[PDB]
Design a protein around this ligand. Structure first.
Ligand SMILES: *[C@@](O)(C(=O)N[C@H](CC)c1ccccc1)[C@H](C)NC(=O)[C@H](CC(=O)N(C)C)NC(=O)[C@@H](NC(=O)[C@@H](NC(=O)CCCCCN)C(C)(C)C)C(C)(C)C
Lengths: 220, 220
């Protein structure tokens, strides 16, 4: 179908796992710069959906401790998951509405942006970093997830990131591990509809990291 | 086995398809008393359909009865689609929210609970084309209530009276109309995530109807 093949091509996601200049909503969420660097120094991390270990869609391509926090670049690859995503997008009035001004329509990308707008990192206090999860909203703030086809392009979606930053990241990115089904994704969709302060929180995150959404596929 | 057949049993729902004591913060619609009365009373009366968010290819059943009452229009529909229910039941097995179950002495009912969190609201589309189950309604006091026994659900709403229940009750006493699929509902899923102030709205209709000061399956 050609098209049905462009869609199901890998999709990168990027964003902060934690923003240093931000005090967690809970003590457990404490993750200071000092800890991060020591950890990264030691400890490929899995990329799943809502922490469900039975819904791994790809892997983490890069982790980096920049200035304002910890930043990762993940890659979605699971053709099983991507297909479903392609199927669902086809029936989303949001996706159908298209993206902002000069950006070209990418249903599978847009749908994930609308669906898992945040990034949640599984940690401990071998390998303190368990995995990264795409979710409707991170528990930490500034964890907006940004989806795009070009990894270079998703990185350029964050002002705080410097040329030096992308250097260290580029020097990182350069079968189907999924195990759930659409029914599963569906069930997860309701849990998402009852998270308090979601959209407000998502918006707060945008402003916090500069993703105007008039430059990305962010839907909040 | 066995219970899965019990869950895939028909489900009832009801609520105000309009609140007379309410002014649409968005005119357009308009429900004024004399209207409906004049409108319901017309033409027995042909089967009104029930669909997910107006998707004529996502029919789940029919409205079983409607009645003009003390504070607005109130309808009790019946969700029957063996195909629709089957999905909702597999999705339910994969929902943390549903996993946590109901309150105080209410027994668990995944299928009911899933619908409860997914289509908290009722929407009215002969003038009355169809009633639709959706994540929320533009017209306030649209909060939907799922139950296995109609009388039970009616019993959830205080404003109602034996009198009212009389008429309603007097009312509810082919093939699989559903045409959509899990991807379809999934697709509608994100669209829902973007309705501004869904919960705060939802919570409102909860007290606006008194269902807060009682026990139900409402997840709001
Ligand atoms: C993340 O943003 C998130 O969970 N978001 C979700 C999206 C649905 C969300 C939740 C509520 C409201 C809105 C959104 C958030 C930053 N991450 C977590 O909360 C994360 C979840 C997780 O990993 N799982 C659910 C598996 N939690 C953690 O990473 C925590 N890690 C642990 O608790 C680890 N525990 C230990 O290392 C010792 C446990 C000792 C037990 C007794 N022996 C572990 C093994 C469970 C990963 C914290 C790092 C936050 C503590």
């Amino acid at each position: 179908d050609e098209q049905q093949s462009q869609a199901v091509a890998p999709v990168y996601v990027g964003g902060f796992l934690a923003r240093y200049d931000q005090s967690p909503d809970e003590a457990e969420l404490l993750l200071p710069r000092d800890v991060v660097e020591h950890w990264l120094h030691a400890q490929a991390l899995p990329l799943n959906i809502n922490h469900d270990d039975t819904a791994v869609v790809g892997h983490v391509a890069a982790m980096q401790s920049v200035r304002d926090g910890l930043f990762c670049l993940g890659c979605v690859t699971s053709p099983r998951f991507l297909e479903i995503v392609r199927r669902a997008s086809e029936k989303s009035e949001l996706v159908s509405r298209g993206p902002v001004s000069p950006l070209q329509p990418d249903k599978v990308v847009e749908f994930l942006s609308g669906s898992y707008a945040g990034l949640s990192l599984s940690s401990r206090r071998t390998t303190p970093f368990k995995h990264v999860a795409l979710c409707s909203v991170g528990r930490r703030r500034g964890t907006l997830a940004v989806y795009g086809r070009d990894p270079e392009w998703v990185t350029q979606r964050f002002p705080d990131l410097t040329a030096a930053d992308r250097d260290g990241l580029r020097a990182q990115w350069q079968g189907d591990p999924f195990r759930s089904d659409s029914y599963g994704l569906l069930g997860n969709s309701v849990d998402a509809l009852y998270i308090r302060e979601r959209l407000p929180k998502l918006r707060y995150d945008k402003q916090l990291v500069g993703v105007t959404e008039r430059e990305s596929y962010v839907k909040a």
